Amino acid sequence: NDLCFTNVYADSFVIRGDEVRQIAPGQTGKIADYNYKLPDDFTGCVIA
Amino acid sequence: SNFGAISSVLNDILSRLDPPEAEVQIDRLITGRLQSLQTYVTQQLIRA
Amino acid sequence: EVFNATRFASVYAWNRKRISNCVADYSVLYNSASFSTFKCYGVSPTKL
Numbered sequence: 001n002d003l004c005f006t007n008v009y010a011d012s013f014v015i016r017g018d019e020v021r022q023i024a025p026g027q028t029g030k031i032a033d034y035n036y037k038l039p040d041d042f043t044g045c046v047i048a
Numbered sequence: 049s050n051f052g053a054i055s056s057v058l059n060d061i062l063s064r065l066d067p068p069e070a071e072v073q074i075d076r077l078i079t080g081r082l083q084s085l086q087t088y089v090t091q092q093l094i095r096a
Numbered sequence: 097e098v099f100n101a102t103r104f105a106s107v108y109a110w111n112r113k114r115i116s117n118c119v120a121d122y123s124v125l126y127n128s129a130s131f132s133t134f135k136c137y138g139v140s141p142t143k144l
């Protein structure tokens with residue numbers, strides 16, 4: 001609440017619920033290998 | 049010496065760990081070898 | 097099959113076999129398995 005930001009974008013989807021560990025910067029499996037991938041140097045928050 | 053790393057020869061460390069992990073190992077090796085170089089240079093200066 | 101082996105007995109049963117002479121496309125492990133957890137202390141699966 002004490003910072004001013006640039007280029008803030010959001011992302012929405014629904015997953016099976018056991019792959020909620022695969023939305024981390026550096027993971028393995030067919031969601032972060034075939035569907036959605038985060039950069040290693042991530043700055044932002046995942047909310048589930 | 050591996051200065052606390054899992055191994056010594058850079059090629060291996062690179063050839064065993066992903067970049068995000070590599071970071072740790074690599075950095076430690078760097079610090080160790082940098083210190084060795086620094087000590088050598090200072091000794092050389094004195095002897096000079 | 098040693099994963100499809102209904103033989104995971106117990107602690108004081110921890111039979112360990114020398115698997116040898118494989119070429120296992122480890123991909124299988126992190127791909128054609130979905131074997132839920134994969135904590136891999138040491139090497140990264142990508143270069144496994």
Ligand SMILES: *[C@@H]1O[C@H](CO)[C@@H](O)[C@H](O)[C@H]1NC(C)=O
Nearest residue numbers: 097099100101128129130131
């Ligand atoms: C053997 O394990 C795989 C997953 O590793 C599974 O797809 C398959 O159904 C299993 N076989 C039997 C007979 O349950």
